[PDB]
Amino acid sequence: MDMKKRIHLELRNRTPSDVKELVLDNCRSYEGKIEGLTDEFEELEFLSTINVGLASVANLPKLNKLKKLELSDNRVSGGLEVLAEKCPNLTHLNLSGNKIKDLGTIEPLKKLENLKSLDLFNCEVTNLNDYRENVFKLLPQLTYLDGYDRDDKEAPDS
Amino acid sequence: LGQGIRLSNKRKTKEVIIKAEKMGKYKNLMREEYKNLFEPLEKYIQKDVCF
Amino acid sequence: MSLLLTIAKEYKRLCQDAKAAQMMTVGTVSNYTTFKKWTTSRKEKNPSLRMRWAMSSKFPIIANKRMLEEAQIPKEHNNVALWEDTEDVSKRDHVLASASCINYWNFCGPCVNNSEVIKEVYKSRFGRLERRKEIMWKELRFTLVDRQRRRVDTQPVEQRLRTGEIKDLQMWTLFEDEAPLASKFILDNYGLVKEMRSKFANKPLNKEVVAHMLEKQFNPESRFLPVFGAIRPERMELIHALGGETWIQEANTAGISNVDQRKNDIRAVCRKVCLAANASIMNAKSKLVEYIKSTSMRIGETERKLEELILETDDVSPEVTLCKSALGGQLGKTLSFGPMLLKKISGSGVKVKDTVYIQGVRAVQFEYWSEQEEFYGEYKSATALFSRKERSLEWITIGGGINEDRKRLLAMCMIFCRDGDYFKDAPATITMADLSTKLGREIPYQYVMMNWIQKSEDNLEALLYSRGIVETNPGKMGSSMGIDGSKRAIKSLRAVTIQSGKIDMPESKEKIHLELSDNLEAFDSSGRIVATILDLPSDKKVTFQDVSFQHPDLAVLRDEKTAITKGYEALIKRLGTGDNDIPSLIAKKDYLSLYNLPEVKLMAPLIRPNRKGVYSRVARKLVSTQVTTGHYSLHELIKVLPFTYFAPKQGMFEGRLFFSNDSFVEPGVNNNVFSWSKADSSKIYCHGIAIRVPLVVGDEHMDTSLALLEGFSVCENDPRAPMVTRQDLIDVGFGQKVRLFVGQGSVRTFKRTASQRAASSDVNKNVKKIKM
């Protein structure tokens, strides 16, 4: 469909200032660009954008109370520096299924001191040598990785 | 002498095959490197071999 | 926006006038088309001349003005003019310009983000290019060619359609707001429309051009041309670069476009079902029609209904002919007598009776035509032109290239004309058993002699001997045919002519509506037979791929998988409108009433009994999770519901859900037992069989009103109900009424209640109740 109509539908007369969660999976965004988001959304604490032909997160607006994100199934590549400024209080992130070519792209995420878990599956980076360990040495703040902590400690449900 | 040389047109749609004994008959066509390596020895050739 | 307000102001200003008001008030909207002609009418005799005479000027072109200002197109860039402020007389909103400005635009003008969409707009021509690139040329040779003229197709096209089917498709892919009522072709071909729409959506484009290109993408260009060699559209599109009257550029083009495979598969299916229905004795007609409508097949990615493809193709075969006749499909005036082909050029006649003695004295009636007639005939690599006269083959000419084919064509021609003494006194070898009636169905002596020839070559030789033989006169030596099929001999057959060079196939753009009998023999407003079931191969075994024989008699599966499939079918049939159905319950979030449906109660016995509770738990869990929020996928509930009938329990769920027949389904991944795709969201594949889900509700995937149209219907107009758009149409309640605008200049009233019944049965039955 289109993120605009999807959003306007999810907003069953509700103001964009009292919601705590939102989902836009199985939609479409022209040029792989966000469309319809603003800073009006303040109380939002969760987001899910999956398989929407997205390619960059530049347009994403500031969201402080947000603490979980999902961007799988898209083709995002080299837009990670923006996340820090917009959403610095973020803890959970997911990117499995996107175009991540090297560890250089993932360096900015160190500034997300509130980060706990990260999910990278089916990406090119995973096909390297000593990637989990090198990543951990890069992001000491991060504890979980793709659902497994150091020593392969399976993470709980929630 | 081993198997003789072969010919070919530009587009390579046609390809002729000749034996060694007759390479002295079409010397004017073969390339230089293959020609300069053939004339000085034509003397020693009898039918298809080299004395 | 402000533009909208401007359009409204313009409409007001225009209505202030009297003539404009009278014309916009009187009559319907169709008058617009007419008005489109009385304006902007101007032609020229020799545009080449006037083009050289105009381009010699300073500003021979017109162009928009605001587009240039917005684009910042200057004037007198480098002492070379591009345009000057003026107003053309016709447009009044355009300004003269020069050709150089176009180059300026192309070089330092505004650039769009992306333009690869073009490859989709003109897919046919990029396909031409690619097909060319995948060719391996060969040597060139010179010689004479036997170029035969005939009607063929030059444009390879998949899913060839009609015009009425195309006009709606364009509107539903580009102008949906202005769309008309949903036609059957749409509801049936949903995935196709979805595909064509996914590409031309949210794009900057000129739409008229796209519509024209789609028309070309669905038009097989039929031409009457000279031809040599094989006949395939892949070649005819570039025939000009393969050979002429005196030269030939050899090249292999066999492995491209995969066309004829589809046709041979179709014909095989037709033969199969024709034989099946022939197995009957009194209802082979209805049996065949049922087998037809109870069958489908895949084309590339999509699944199409058989009866729909049959009415679009033009394969003149004795199988396709019968089918197209049963379905009332009109067709051309082309005959078929066994493997050969025939076409009448001129003449007339009428049936007549005669008899022959098979062995000793055994009278058997056989008919013939009492007049002079002329016929063209085409067998494998052989052509012929002959004439019949009162049960005799008057003359014949041939232009083939083989002796065997020549002899076979001649023999089948002699038979078709009942020429010879055999039709006067049959041979001893034949008997009453070989006569007819494998199981009661009679056989005219014609096809009898046919199979008698196909049996042994010596029967054919004797038949040829039945034709007069004489000594080859001088000069005619070249135009003579022996018994072996030699272009010359010392003694040759009677009334025969040979020549090198095929015969030019005739042509006629005519159509006829024929019928058939209970014995599968078609008639054409006369006692003439165009097709039958005796002119096709006897039988053969084939393994059809990507087909759906959803019919009991035409099925090989066991009662177990069939029971599962029928349970799924019933459970989907409960996907309609009205309370007590699953859509209303989802809307009300009554995820519990689903567990108590009767259909799950009928499919429950099929569940593995030792682990039915655990699976039940999981199923109910998923359902609640999907229903409570609203983010569900209809293709998973229909799959897991049959397990929610029993009571939950405790245990470890491995990940699969087994039935009692060691066949499982997995929740999230497609398998042999239950498959589907986001591309074609209107199908469910169970055990290979396909099932058509109605379009009443749309989940996250479906993203238009197309998925809701099978839930709506027309009703008596009510001015009290509101008028809404095509997007808010989803927020109505099942059983409610609402007014709406459809297509152009038309408003109606709809109700979200369906009617699964069709007209076919309601008419056929009521008719049969009248012949008593």
UniProtKB/Swiss-Prot annotation, chain B:
Q: How is it modified after translation?
A: Phosphorylated by host PRKCA.
Q: Where in the cell is it found?
A: Host nucleus; Host cytoplasm
On subunit structure and binding partners, the annotation says: Influenza RNA polymerase is composed of three subunits: PB1, PB2 and PA. Interacts (via N-terminus) with PA (via C-terminus). Interacts (via C-terminus) with PB2 (via N-terminus); this interaction is essential for transcription initiation.
Cited function: RNA-dependent RNA polymerase which is responsible for replication and transcription of virus RNA segments. The transcription of viral mRNAs occurs by a unique mechanism called cap-snatching. 5' methylated caps of cellular mRNAs are cleaved after 10-13 nucleotides by PA. In turn, these short capped RNAs are used as primers by PB1 for transcription of viral mRNAs. During virus replication, PB1 initiates RNA synthesis and copy vRNA into complementary RNA (cRNA) which in turn serves as a template for the production of more vRNAs.
In which family does this protein belong, per the annotation? Answer: Belongs to the influenza viruses polymerase PB1 family.
- Name of the molecule in the record: RNA-directed RNA polymerase catalytic subunit
Organism, scientific name: Influenza C virus (strain C/Johannesburg/1/1966)
What gene name does this entry carry? PB1
Span within the parent record: 353 to 403 of 754
Curated annotation (Swiss-Prot), chain C:
* An example Gene Ontology molecular-function term: RNA-directed RNA polymerase activity
GO CC annotation terms, alphabetical: host cell nucleus; virion component
Keywords on this record? Cap snatching, Eukaryotic host gene expression shutoff by virus, Eukaryotic host transcription shutoff by virus, Host gene expression shutoff by virus, Host nucleus, Host-virus interaction, Inhibition of host RNA polymerase II by virus, mRNA capping, mRNA processing, Viral transcription, Virion
What's the short name of a Pfam family annotated to this entry?
Flu_PB2_7th
- Please give the superkingdom of this protein's source: Viruses
- Could you tell me where this protein is found in the cell? Virion; Host nucleus
* Gene Ontology annotations of biological process type: 7-methylguanosine mRNA capping; cap snatching; DNA-templated transcription; symbiont-mediated suppression of host gene expression; symbiont-mediated suppression of host mRNA transcription via inhibition of RNA polymerase II activity; viral RNA genome replication
**Any transmembrane segments, and where?**
none
Q: What does this protein do?
A: Plays an essential role in transcription initiation and cap-stealing mechanism, in which cellular capped pre-mRNAs are used to generate primers for viral transcription. Recognizes and binds a wide range of cap structures of target pre-RNAs which are subsequently cleaved after 10-13 nucleotides by the viral protein PA. Plays a role in the initiation of the viral genome replication and modulates the activity of the ribonucleoprotein (RNP) complex.
* Entry similarity comment: Belongs to the influenza viruses PB2 family.
Self-association or partners: how does it assemble? Influenza RNA polymerase is composed of three subunits: PB1, PB2 and PA. Interacts (via N-terminus) with PB1 (via C-terminus). Interacts with nucleoprotein NP (via N-terminus). Interacts with host ANP32A (via C-terminus); this interaction promotes viral RNA synthesis.
Q: What name goes with this protein?
A: Polymerase basic protein 2
